[model samples]
Target: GSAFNGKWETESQEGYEPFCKLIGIPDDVIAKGRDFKLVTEIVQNGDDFTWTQYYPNNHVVTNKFIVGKESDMETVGGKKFKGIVSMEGGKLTISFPKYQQTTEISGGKLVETSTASGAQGTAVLVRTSKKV
Candidate 1:
C-alpha cells in the first residue's frame, strides 16, 4: 500500500514557531515558513508521507516515505538489517541496514551511523506488493 496513492489537501497545521522559539530562531527569518505547509500525505492501503521544506531560493528538500508489509530480510556490508512494513499513526516506516553503523530504525529513518563520530550514507527503499 502506498500512502501517496490519493490526493492531499492542506489541513490544520502547527506552525514551527515552537521549534524556532525553543531553538532561538529570529522572529524576522522565522516568519517565512511559519505559515507554509510542512507536510504532505496520501492514503492508500498504506501510508505515504513527505516532509516539505525549503531553504530560501537555493534549496528544497521533500523527503518521501512509504508504508507496507515487509516479507524479505537481507544482509549487506556485513551488517544485518530487516525490512519493516508497519502501520503507525497513519504513516509507513520502511527500514534497512546501515553502511557505516549498526542496523536500527528510529523516527521513520534507518539509523546506521553514530553521531558521536561521523557517517555519510542512506539506504534506499525498495517496495513490493502482495499478489492476490
Candidate 2:
C-alpha cells in the first residue's frame, strides 16, 4: 500500500511514558522524549521493510526486517535484540524479547501499538502518526 512508504510524524501518544517506565527506560531518556517530535521514515521493498525513527536531540533508530523472517533490531533506548517481523490483517507486527509492536494505516494515519511485558507488569503504548 502507498501508506506503507513515506515520512510520518507523531501526532499523538498514549500510555507511552508508562510503557517506557515499565520497560525500564532511563528517566533522563524518557524525559527527553516526552514532548519530542518523532519522525518515522519507512521504506518498503517487496516483503522487506526499513523503518527509521528520528528523535529530537539527534537520537535515531533504524530497523530492517523481512516479512516472516527473524532479524536483528534495536530499540529507542539502544537495547538490541533479535525479532521476527510478520504481517497479519495488513498490520505489520514485530515481536522481540520483551516487546511486541503492531503498525497499520488507518484513516490516513499510521497507528502503532506497542506492548511490553516484564516484572513490572504489562504496558500498552499507542502512537498515531500522520504523513509528512
Candidate 3:
C-alpha cells in the first residue's frame, strides 16, 4: 500500500523520553526510542505535501492547533477519523466524528459477532470537492 504522503514537522517529544524509561525500556533501547508524544505540523497545499513523523514509539499522536476550520468525517477500520488539514489555520482537528450520537451495535451483539463471525463494519463514502 502507498503511504499517506505529505509534509509535516515534529512539534514535540520533550517528555516522551522519560515515558519510555518509566515503561522499563533499557537505556540502549531507550536510546533506540520508545513511547511517544509527537505532534506533526503539516502543510498540505493542493494535492501534494511533505509528511514527517516525530516520535520515539513510531506511533502517531494527536496534536493539532490550527484554528477556524473544520473537517469532514472519514472512517477506517470501523472508527471515524479526520483526514483533512484545516484550510484556514491548518489545524488537524476532525470534529465531525464526535457528533455521532448513536451506538451502532450493542456490546453483546458486537461480542457475539466478533466471536461467531468475522464481522468487519464496512462503509461507502464519497470525497468532498477539492479546494482550488
Q: Identify the runs in model 3 with alpha carbons over 4 angstroms from their true place.
A: 1-43, 57-85, 89-93, 99-132
Model 2 residue pairs with clashes = none
Ranking by TM-score: 2, 1, 3
Model 2: how far is 20 from its true place, Å? Answer: 2.1
Candidate 2 C-alpha error for residue 85, in Å = 0.7
Tell me the tens digit of each residue's lDDT in model 2 across 25-109. 8889898777766899999987888999997678899999898987888887699988788889889997767878899999989
- Estimate candidate 2's alpha-carbon lDDT, on a 0 to 1 scale: 0.88
Per-residue lDDT for 1-132 in model 1, tens only?
Answer: 442343232332333454444445588867875554322323343244443333444444444444453443333222443454555554344434332222222443322221111132222222221111
Say which prediction, candidate 1 or candidate 3, comes out ahead on TM-score. Answer: 1
By lDDT, the better pick of 1 and 3 is 1
State, as a TM-score between 0 and 1, how close model 3 is to the true structure: 0.23
Q: Name the 10 consecutive residues with the lowest summed lDDT in model 3.
A: 109-118
